[PDB]
Curated annotation (Swiss-Prot):
Its cofactor is [4Fe-4S] cluster. It catalyses: Couples ATP hydrolysis with the unwinding of duplex DNA at the replication fork by translocating in the 5'-3' direction. This creates two antiparallel DNA single strands (ssDNA). The leading ssDNA polymer is the template for DNA polymerase III holoenzyme which synthesizes a continuous strand; ATP + H2O = ADP + phosphate + H(+). This is ATP-dependent DNA helicase XPD. Changing R465W: Loss of helicase and ATPase. It comes from Sulfolobus acidocaldarius (strain ATCC 33909 / DSM 639 / JCM 8929 / NBRC 15157 / NCIMB 11770).
Length: 485
């Protein structure tokens, strides 16, 4: 609209551009038009292979434009471990742009391109891409599949090592004592990937994934953490994955439905160059998303001090109670898979607890005319992106439930994040460290409910803590009806 200039000006003017555009607001198309007015080629960096369609579509509808899709390396082999360069507009997935070792994979300049990163509220969980991990489970299938002999010797010694360094706790516990493997021991194992990468192929070999795990560990930046019975090397440094956005030689546009506050991007994401932060709401001075009713539970909370079995009983009743009264499916959001269980293991209703796999079909295979379904999902990626809710033209979900507060746990991974940011974990950063991230999850969820300007739905904030005026303000909903039972 008016933006189309304030932006094209900024891009050419070399400022980094952020756009806070609500769900189904026309977003995608905008950058399309505006990019082909700032630079020749246009690059699209998206969450998953799904987002690729709103491209081709909004792309095919352009006057004066050859597209070049790109599906993962694994889903093509005629675990990623050609006629592209001839495209005016290409589309990639997070990795092919953020993984140093995945960019060179795709020989690209980027300069000739207008870079558009979609749903950039994920730049935090971008470290997630590279994390590798060991689970007693692999250390096993890795032994059954063992053409070599003395590879199972080290393969069980490790299984032992592992066990000594992992707790079920659903939080990142820093690990010192990390199973050790001498280069020679690697050999025995590397040559076992051989006899395997032969006889078996003479017709996924996860004995190398173990290797990838130690290979990556070799670097040095990554840190080992025990997260739910699995070892996990993960690089806490964020501004080590997003520093690419500072290169003043790159025109960039960051957009999402719930982009984080300017300072967050500064203090957390480590984004230094000049920035033009434009938000649709404060612009056309109107709400573009879809309205929703606010009901705040105040006889419940997920906080440690008050949580118990009686507590989980309550919640199960809320779900039960919010289920029927609903006009359609219900999407419930838990802070951890643990809680999602004690509350869900109560409900004798038609549920679907996404977890680990939960295939594409799986989900709609769960809402397969089964009428209302109480869908469980924990606020940590997995279930999200591309998965709209649009079928015969009706947001399949009428109610979005938030059980407790999806604040991030103050664990070791969180503590190494605050120190790599010289952002003292005190009071001043409560927001950036916990609140803000917690605010994205919820909103990223109320979003999967609405997709139009009219499209309405209920939002249940089940946790006394939500009646504070802060939450009421930040989750576009002051006029909120309180309630018990």
């Amino acid at each position: 609209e008016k933006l189309k200039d304030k932006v094209i000006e900024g891009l050419r003017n070399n400022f980094l551009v952020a756009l806070n555009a609500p769900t189904g607001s026309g977003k995608t198309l905008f950058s399309l038009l505006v990019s082909l007015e700032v630079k020749p080629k246009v690059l699209f960096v998206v969450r998953t292979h799904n987002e690729f369609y709103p491209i081709y579509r909004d792309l095919t509808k352009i006057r004066e434009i050859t597209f070049s899709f790109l599906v993962g390396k694994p889903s093509s082999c005629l675990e990623s471990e050609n006629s592209l360069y001839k495209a005016d507009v290409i589309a990639l997935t997070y990795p092919y742009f953020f993984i140093d070792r995945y960019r060179e994979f795709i020989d690209i300049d980027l300069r000739e391109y207008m870079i558009v990163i979609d749903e950039a509220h994920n730049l935090d969980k971008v470290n997630e891409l590279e994390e590798r991990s060991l689970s007693e489970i692999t250390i096993q299938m890795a032994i059954k599949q063992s053409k070599s002999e003395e590879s199972r010797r080290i393969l069980s010694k490790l299984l032992n090592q592992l066990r000594e360094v992992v707790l079920p706790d659903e939080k990142y516990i820093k690990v010192e004592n990390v199973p050790k493997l001498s280069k020679e021991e690697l050999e025995i194992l590397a040559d076992d990937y051989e006899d395997i990468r032969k006889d078996s192929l003479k017709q996924k070999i996860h004995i190398g994934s173990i290797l990838r795990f130690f290979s990556l560990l070799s670097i040095g930046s990554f840190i080992p953490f025990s997260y739910s019975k699995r070892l996990v090397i993960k690089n806490p440094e964020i501004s080590y994955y997003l520093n690419l956005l500072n290169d003043n030689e790159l025109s960039i546009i960051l957009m999402s439905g719930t982009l984080p506050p300017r300072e967050y991007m500064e203090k957390v994401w480590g984004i230094k160059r000049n920035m033009l932060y434009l938000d649709v709401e404060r612009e056309i001075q109107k709400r573009v998303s879809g309205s929703y009713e606010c009901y705040i539970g105040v006889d419940v909370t997920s906080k440690y001090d008050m949580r118990s079995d009686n507590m989980w009983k309550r919640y199960a009743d809320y779900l039960l109670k919010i289920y029927f009264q609903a006009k359609a499916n219900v999407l419930v959001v838990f802070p951890s898979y643990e809680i999602m269980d004690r509350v869900m293991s109560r409900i004798s209703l038609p549920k679907y607890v996404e977890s680990e796999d939960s295939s594409v079909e799986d989900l709609y295979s769960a809402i397969s005319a089964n009428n209302k379904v109480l869908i469980g999902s924990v606020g940590k990626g997995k279930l999200a992106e591309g998965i709209e809710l649009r079928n015969n033209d009706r947001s399949l979900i009428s109610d979005v439930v938030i059980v407790g507060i999806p604040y991030p746990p103050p664990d070791d991974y969180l503590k190494i994040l605050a120190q790599r940011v010289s952002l003292k974990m005190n009071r001043e950063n409560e927001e950036f460290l916990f609140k803000i991230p917690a605010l994205v999850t919820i909103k990223q969820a109320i979003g999967r409910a609405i997709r139009d300007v009219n499209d309405k739905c209920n939002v249940w904030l089940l946790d006394k803590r939500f009646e504070s005026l802060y939450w009421k303000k930040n989750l576009k909903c002051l006029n909120a009806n309180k309630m018990k039972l």
